[PDB]
Design an enzyme around this catalytic site. Structure first.
Site, PDB file in Angstrom:
ATOM      1  N   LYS A   1       0.853  -1.177   0.000  1.00 44.96           N
ATOM      2  CA  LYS A   1       0.000   0.000   0.000  1.00 44.96           C
ATOM      3  C   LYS A   1       0.888   1.226   0.000  1.00 44.96           C
ATOM      4  O   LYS A   1       1.827   1.295   0.795  1.00 44.96           O
ATOM      5  CB  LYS A   1      -0.915   0.007   1.231  1.00 44.96           C
ATOM      6  CG  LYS A   1      -2.087   1.024   1.186  1.00 44.96           C
ATOM      7  CD  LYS A   1      -3.207   0.549   0.268  1.00 44.96           C
ATOM      8  CE  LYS A   1      -4.482   1.261   0.521  1.00 44.96           C
ATOM      9  NZ  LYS A   1      -5.527   0.709  -0.353  1.00 44.96           N
TER      10      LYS A   1
ATOM     11  N   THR B   1      -4.682  -4.894   1.126  1.00 45.80           N
ATOM     12  CA  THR B   1      -3.877  -3.673   1.199  1.00 45.80           C
ATOM     13  C   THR B   1      -4.641  -2.581   1.957  1.00 45.80           C
ATOM     14  O   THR B   1      -4.028  -1.742   2.628  1.00 45.80           O
ATOM     15  CB  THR B   1      -3.463  -3.207  -0.208  1.00 45.80           C
ATOM     16  OG1 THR B   1      -4.622  -2.772  -0.921  1.00 45.80           O
ATOM     17  CG2 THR B   1      -2.781  -4.333  -1.013  1.00 45.80           C
TER      18      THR B   1
HETATM   19  O1  LIG Z   1      -6.936  -7.076  -6.149  1.00 47.33           O
HETATM   20  C1  LIG Z   1      -6.789  -6.738  -5.004  1.00 47.33           C
HETATM   21  N1  LIG Z   1      -5.684  -7.171  -4.326  1.00 47.33           N
HETATM   22  C2  LIG Z   1      -5.440  -6.860  -3.054  1.00 47.33           C
HETATM   23  O2  LIG Z   1      -4.454  -7.283  -2.504  1.00 47.33           O
HETATM   24  C3  LIG Z   1      -6.324  -6.045  -2.410  1.00 47.33           C
HETATM   25  N2  LIG Z   1      -6.314  -5.532  -1.173  1.00 47.33           N
HETATM   26  N3  LIG Z   1      -7.397  -4.738  -1.060  1.00 47.33           N
HETATM   27  N4  LIG Z   1      -8.083  -4.752  -2.229  1.00 47.33           N
HETATM   28  C4  LIG Z   1      -7.427  -5.549  -3.077  1.00 47.33           C
HETATM   29  N5  LIG Z   1      -7.648  -5.898  -4.360  1.00 47.33           N
END
Ligand SMILES: O=c1[nH]c(=O)c2nn[nH]c2[nH]1
Ligand SMILES: O=c1[nH]c(=O)c2nn[nH]c2[nH]1
Ligand SMILES: O=c1[nH]c(=O)c2nn[nH]c2[nH]1
Ligand SMILES: O=c1[nH]c(=O)c2nn[nH]c2[nH]1
Lengths: 295, 295, 296, 296
Positions: free
Chosen positions: D6, D66
């Site tokens: 992130k 994330t």
């Molecule tokens: O495709 C995704 N991967 C991730 O790791 C993730 N984490 N939050 N949203 C997400 N969407």
């Protein structure tokens, strides 16, 4: 670390030798480049032990001025008789090490400055202009090259990498993100149908670096083709995450281009928040993924 | 001056009513908009004498929160049954003034967030995706609307304007800039064949404001069509200056669209310095022009 | 509309005459400007009916090249003997219209490119350097001037405005936003103690245009002083809204500078979202804004 | 390569424990940080062989979202009881690896969001406000940390680096660039007195990682102090090139801070082109740069 150089060396050449004779693939109409307008942004970095006193003593005796590096690049674009950014970087690198015997290593980045065709009417017939082009601030091809002088004075490419940068794709449905860890820090809701919005940088390496130059165009892998593979795979995949998507794009690339050794991804998540269906921009924090697929 | 509002109100609508039934012109393939994805960035400003004490006394009794204005816009995109940004602004303006009797004036800007089609293959057949779109950072459509409440409580649109922003065009040959004033301040050499690089922002006003809404699509002027007129005129014209070019573009637009009252240009010069032919980026200072052609 | 010109004319002058002899106010320590380095970013626009055929016929006979306008501005910064961006614009505008008699109207914007002092040790002590300066990307002074040529060939200023742009101020407590309309479009919670974060552009107009030039520096209103009024009033006030705040700033400005006719605000709301200690984060992109004039 | 994470995790904390008890140097008045407002922009990357099927199979059973990483960071800033970004990263990293046993590596970047003091008049005098701060878009402190989980479930820092980014310094005289190679690619004139304008990004590494945390603040190296060394050495030095300057800055840093192992520079040349008084303007876009380490 000890090196120095010149960045943002923009150079625009008209009527470069056209790139023709490429091997097409099903995902892409790409069949070459007219090169009426060929734009590149170059960065050059050079090193060598003999540069030490330019730092430690203020001795400019062995300093090629970074301004002169800019002249070097632009003048070599005027004399370049090849057909790709990759080959242009090899030309600049070989030429620079041949010129400056005190330089031991050179690293080059070339970034495409892309231009798109426009419509013009002649005798009532609308077709692509051969004169007027539109500057694009969307995706662009890239190329990277590192060359060294060995102890026996031979020159050697130690790294080469081509790429596609800045590809921003949104798929309105047929994407899920479910099943992830739910604990004290998890507030994200599962979503069985999200409008997944990814940014993609895609880079590839060749089994044989000579294939990157374009001289045998049938072995050249075009960034345009990579783009169209990415959109095709995105379309046909019920994605389960960005992770899952980029693995499948990489597998398809390597299937279409067996002359490639690996494909590398840097992706970012920019999916909109849901408020007919209306979405809006999220807060700034963005997810990202980095992943290599190997042949 | 006394007003307040909300900017950068991004809103993304899927499956808006398609724009169909438009009139197509020779310069452009444009024949409507699928509206699978409809993106708009909205700025709202509101005024009224009864807002005075929100400033002079800190009285929030008559303050619609700017945050609430954002909600207002996004909810109205969800319920909008029309087919154009220009018409969406009229929907928001009328709705807002009907809702809040103490507001006397509302100005709205809507800027298209454009998405391009992409390729996908199915069973060996490559075609445009109905699902995957490419976010574009190039030119985009715009709309502007000012609406007031009269003393007899009727509502009146006092200004409307549509536009195309961010169009960047380079013509590699067929351009001159000669005959300008040469005195103590003139160092620019005359150039009979320059690769003129212009940025264009083109705005138009309708003779009848209703034609901007798309209710009768035959009278609608699409920014896509304006773009392709501009590239076609640039192509065919041996330009003598940017001033000369934009006049001719404006004349062509007004010829092609007699329902228009005026075309307004904001142009900038970004022509490269000359160093095969190779050019490079200039120093930052940029020329610009502003001109109205009227019907 | 018909005009053309040159933007992003950057020009950096060393050792301009210093600005001194200014009149102080309680909210500000401002006492002048050294002008070892004086940076300005100029935009010039010109007009005149005699330019028509440069558009309608491609006749460049009466076109001053925009490249030449750049040269004009940069050369005049080298010969400028005054002490303000405002006075520099008057110098350029008067000089340009005298030079080009077919031009009827000129508009100029000048934006300060600000540099800050740095420390150096020499000869036994640390002190402000007379040589090394730090480029600032924060707030900056602005000036605007329009001048016209009349039928009798006299020149007149038709609008002048000075300003401070890009001031970004956050106040960690002592701000509320309550009592606003709560209806079917409202999801904003009432907040009796928010960390209000405003962007401020502040522009002022003089009763007497001569006071803008610095020639009698006691009548000049410095952007540095306006900045310090804004921060002081923000601190002093239990704010009830941005609207409330900017009116109070404007009133203090006009009280401190009776030679001003009015002061105009463009404000934007960038207040963070709240998540042991208090933590906040960046909001979504949409931003509130206010535009308001206080008059003398 | 396999990792995910992130970026742009902005987090703003009020009333963090102040940084005091630091050791001073001649070039800098720096004596600590109030921490009324402590803003950081964090990037987190994580890795581990057990994440493979999240890519190869679309299996999310071991995916920390994330979005959850963003919550993790922001909540940990609320509970952080230390005094530096460097120490904050160690707290986040250790806590994250303890929480998620299947993650083998974590990398963190923390970038300061700096705020400057402002003036307010209250109770009869003007003084620094304890409430109103100015957001700065100039230079800012940085921190980097990488931590790994070993086979025996112990955790180790594998790399730590602190820095100062975005420092833009112009010295109006007392700089030359002469004596460089003049061949068929050379069109740059020699210049015995140029207004050298550099951008600097300076990064340092400690002999002992613990000294980066601030726990014993006498061993902490503050970005503010590094800034002031850079401005002092630039002033003091008749520069012969950027290369010459940065070596001298690095030597002074290492002399002042014997607890440092090395200092690394990324510099860029942005010197203006020369057009009564001296006037310069912005160059074309291509910029020279230098990358150089000085070790202890
Ligand atoms: O495709 C995704 N991967 C991730 O790791 C993730 N984490 N939050 N949203 C997400 N969407
Ligand atoms: O097209 C142009 N118009 C102008 O006014 C101008 N001035 N310099 N170059 C120019 N080009
Ligand atoms: O100070 C404020 N004024 C407003 O008008 C507003 N609207 N939402 N938040 C707000 N804050
Ligand atoms: O300080 C400098 N170092 C360089 O290497 C250089 N090259 N051009 N100008 C320069 N200035």
């Amino acid at each position: 670390v000890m090196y120095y150089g010149k960045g943002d060396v923009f150079a625009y050449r008209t009527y470069l030798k056209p790139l023709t004779g490429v091997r097409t693939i099903p995902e892409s109409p790409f069949s070459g480049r007219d090169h009426i307008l060929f734009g590149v942004n170059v960065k050059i970095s050079v090193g060598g032990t003999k540069l030490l006193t330019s730092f430690t003593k203020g001795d400019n005796s062995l300093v090629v001025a970074t301004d002169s590096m800019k002249n070097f690049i632009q003048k070599h674009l005027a004399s370049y008789t090849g057909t790709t950014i990759e080959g242009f970087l090899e030309y600049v690198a070989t030429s620079f090490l041949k010129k400056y015997s005190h330089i031991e290593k050179i690293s080059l980045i070339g970034e495409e400055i892309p231009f798109e065709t426009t419509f013009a009417v002649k005798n009532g017939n609308r077709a692509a202009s051969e004169l007027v082009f539109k500057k694009s601030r969307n995706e662009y091809a890239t190329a990277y090259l590192n060359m060294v002088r060995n102890e026996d004075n031979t020159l050697n490419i130690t790294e080469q990498q081509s790429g596609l940068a800045g590809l921003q794709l949104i798929k309105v449905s047929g994407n899920s993100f479910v099943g992830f860890i739910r604990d004290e820090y998890t507030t994200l809701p599962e979503d069985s149908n999200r409008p997944l919005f990814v940014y993609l940088n895609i880079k590839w390496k060749y089994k044989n670096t000579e294939d990157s130059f374009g001289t045998n165009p049938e072995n050249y892998v075009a960034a345009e083709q990579i783009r169209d593979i990415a959109t095709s795979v995105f379309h046909e995949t019920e994605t389960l995450s960005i992770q899952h998507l980029i693995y499948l794009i990489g597998r398809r690339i390597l299937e279409r281009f067996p002359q490639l050794q690996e494909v590398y991804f840097e992706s970012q998540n920019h999916t909109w928040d849901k408020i007919g269906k209306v979405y809006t921009e999220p807060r700034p924090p963005y997810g990202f993924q980095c992943f290599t697929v190997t042949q």
